[PDB]
Amino acid sequence: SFKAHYGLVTGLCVTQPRFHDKKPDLKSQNFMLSCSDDKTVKLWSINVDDYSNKNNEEGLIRTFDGESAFQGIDSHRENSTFATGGAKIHLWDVNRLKPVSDLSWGADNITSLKFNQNETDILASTGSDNSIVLYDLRTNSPTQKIVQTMRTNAICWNPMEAFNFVTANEDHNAYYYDMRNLSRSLNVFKDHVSAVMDVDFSPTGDEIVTGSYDKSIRIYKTNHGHSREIYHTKRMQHVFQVKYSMDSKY
Amino acid sequence: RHRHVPQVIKKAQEIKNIELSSIKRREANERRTRKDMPYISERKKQIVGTV
Amino acid sequence: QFRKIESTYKKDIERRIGGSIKARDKEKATKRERGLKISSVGRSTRNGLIVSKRDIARIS
Amino acid sequence: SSVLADALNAINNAEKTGKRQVLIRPSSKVIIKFLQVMQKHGYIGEFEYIDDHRSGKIVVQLNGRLNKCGVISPRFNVKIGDIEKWTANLLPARQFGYVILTTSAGIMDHEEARRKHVSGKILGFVY
Amino acid sequence: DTNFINFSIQKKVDIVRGMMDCLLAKCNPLITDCVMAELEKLGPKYRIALKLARDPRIKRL
Amino acid sequence: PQAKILSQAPTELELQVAQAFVELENSSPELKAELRPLQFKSIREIDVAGGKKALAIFVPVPSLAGFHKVQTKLTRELEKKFQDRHVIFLAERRTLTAVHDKILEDLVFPTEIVGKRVRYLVGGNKIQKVLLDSKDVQQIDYKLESFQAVYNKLTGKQIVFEIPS
């Protein structure tokens, strides 16, 4: 465990970073990448015990500065890149402590962001003035901003399709989109009752788990558009983040 | 289909389903009176617009 | 409870229905637990919390 | 005064009903500079103002993280060496639950009143 | 138990240094996994007493 | 119309509107008829984020109510000589923030605004946004940066504008 930040943790990712001076021990150590509330991004080396080949550096390898509050973080699937989100989105390099490349529509704010799995240089983000934005890293420019009725919370990409993503709009709805045409949403899911906090694809690209402010977790298939299962307990209250497993069984 | 949901979910869903069905027939009488309004798809009703 | 009428009179179904539905009657007659009170200084009103001047003078 | 009264009690049943979007009429500037203090300390999120040209209207998004907010009545005077007793009076915990006071710096939070070494004037409490 | 927890919140006394006054000797509290499961099964109206229960100074077993 | 309507002539840019007063006079049936009670006092020079710049011309408000309909007519005959330029027709007056929004609404009187917006963000700072008017907006999109750039030069506070559509 690590007492990371004095503020609220607003984001977390794991990755295998690459540094120019040395390649870190990815086998014996995994790597968090946190995101604070008070202008702080911190790397964390985490010792694991999945390998008996080995037998220090127990945590806090590097820190990153900030001028405004950060609301979210997402790590690129390749080339050890990651971008923050908050009052102003800017990309970050592991080897560079400087703010690398700053992006904005005008004066706008961001509550979450998510890289895709395939065609990996596509970074999507959710704005705060009910807006969903898209970027392409290899073009070094954002693409567009689809605006909605009222704001959303979370986005995650389909791993098997790579142009489809699920958005969690703070009514009782989750929306299924396509990057080619954003005006025709491919599917909707409307089986909740309150604001939805999180959505996560299955790694087999078939089912989408989700969770809302009412104490419930909905699972639905991609095609059906209605929740096939509801999980709930009295011992749960107000789920905020829900993810699949990596083998889609948990 | 049947699953045990709490009454916190169930009671508010009843109010939502009453209000949503209220919205449906309050648009249907507008559909009968007005001649040809746009038949907006439910996949398109949640977008204010694009760029 | 329901209304004891001629329909249940000739049907003789008070012995199989039990007119006062005792599970809904129990959960309605049982008052719910309130919020866990903490701030024992004054009286909860529309204007937040109101304490007496004697309580102010005895704590100053 | 009364504009302070009807603001916060409408907030702290809305979190009991769990409504995401809430509306606050009327609008003054002392409720305006109060309302980021819980946002600074992490109880609420983002919020707005609608300005119809009589007094205004506050649009507030809610993210949970609020058990009870409330002003104190009547007018409360406080010294610098009294707040720790006031925490024992009308506040549950010792590490969380946050009280406020207005000084020459304005409304701000009570442990930095000791850091700025200034007495003030207490109006409310948040826990 | 919960009735110890909820009344201590009602009577303005925190656990660890509050146990110091009566028993007067050094003592550390431990809460079973069964109790904290049902204490937090009380729901939303006791979540501040939930927060005082989960604490690195209160041991758990 | 050369050295009489100028109000401390000998700086640079008011001589350019001194000669821009001259050809505006000899359209005599209607144009010099409304040109009688005007009096312009000063120029302030404004830089924008682009390589182009902005100019502002100022009045002591003797007859601004009559000057309001003068302003909208004077637009179409001024970029024909001030090509690749923008001019804004303003004033200065002597609670101070309640004064400040008045010079904003004389600044934006072509397609006057209907709403005002701020947000208090999670970094503890402040942004503020202006809700505009949706009538003939095909020039303001190229020049809402110009009404952006005059006022942070005037005050320092950073504004946002956005049209409804």
Coordinates of N, CA, C and O in Angstrom, one line a residue, chain D residues 32 36 39 45-51 53 59, chain F residues 114-125:
Chain D
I32 N -22.0 32.4 -2.8 CA -21.1 32.1 -3.9 C -19.7 31.7 -3.4 O -19.2 30.7 -3.9
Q36 N -17.4 26.9 -3.1 CA -16.3 26.2 -3.5 C -15.5 25.6 -2.4 O -14.5 24.9 -2.6
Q39 N -16.0 22.2 -2.4 CA -15.3 21.8 -3.6 C -13.8 21.8 -3.5 O -13.2 20.9 -4.1
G45 N -18.7 18.7 -6.6 CA -18.0 18.8 -7.9 C -18.1 20.2 -8.5 O -17.6 21.2 -7.9
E46 N -18.7 20.3 -9.7 CA -18.8 21.5 -10.4 C -20.2 22.1 -10.3 O -21.1 21.4 -10.0
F47 N -20.3 23.4 -10.5 CA -21.6 24.1 -10.4 C -21.5 25.4 -11.2 O -20.5 25.8 -11.7
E48 N -22.7 26.0 -11.3 CA -23.0 27.1 -12.3 C -23.7 28.3 -11.5 O -23.8 28.3 -10.3
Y49 N -24.0 29.3 -12.3 CA -25.1 30.2 -12.0 C -25.9 30.5 -13.2 O -25.4 30.7 -14.3
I50 N -27.3 30.4 -13.1 CA -28.1 31.1 -14.0 C -28.4 32.5 -13.5 O -28.7 32.7 -12.3
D51 N -28.3 33.5 -14.4 CA -28.6 34.9 -14.0 C -29.8 35.4 -14.8 O -29.7 35.9 -15.9
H53 N -32.2 38.5 -14.4 CA -31.7 39.8 -13.8 C -32.6 40.3 -12.7 O -33.0 41.4 -12.6
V59 N -27.0 26.6 -10.3 CA -27.1 25.2 -10.8 C -25.9 24.4 -10.2 O -24.8 24.8 -10.4
Chain F
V114 N -27.4 37.7 -24.8 CA -28.6 37.3 -24.0 C -28.2 36.6 -22.7 O -29.1 36.4 -21.9
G115 N -27.0 36.2 -22.5 CA -26.7 35.4 -21.3 C -25.2 35.5 -20.9 O -24.4 35.8 -21.7
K116 N -25.0 35.2 -19.6 CA -23.6 35.2 -19.0 C -23.4 34.0 -18.1 O -24.4 33.5 -17.5
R117 N -22.2 33.5 -18.1 CA -21.8 32.2 -17.5 C -20.5 32.3 -16.9 O -19.6 32.9 -17.4
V118 N -20.3 31.7 -15.7 CA -19.0 31.4 -15.1 C -19.0 30.0 -14.7 O -20.0 29.3 -14.5
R119 N -17.8 29.4 -14.4 CA -17.7 28.2 -13.7 C -16.5 28.2 -12.7 O -15.5 28.8 -13.0
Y120 N -16.6 27.6 -11.6 CA -15.6 27.5 -10.6 C -15.0 26.1 -10.7 O -15.7 25.2 -10.2
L121 N -13.8 26.0 -11.1 CA -13.2 24.7 -11.5 C -12.4 24.1 -10.3 O -12.2 24.7 -9.3
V122 N -12.1 22.8 -10.5 CA -11.5 21.9 -9.5 C -10.1 22.3 -9.1 O -9.6 21.9 -8.1
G123 N -9.5 23.2 -9.9 CA -8.2 23.7 -9.5 C -8.3 25.0 -8.6 O -7.3 25.6 -8.3
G124 N -9.5 25.4 -8.2 CA -9.7 26.5 -7.4 C -9.8 27.8 -8.2 O -10.0 28.9 -7.6
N125 N -9.7 27.8 -9.5 CA -9.6 29.0 -10.4 C -11.0 29.2 -11.0 O -12.0 28.6 -10.7

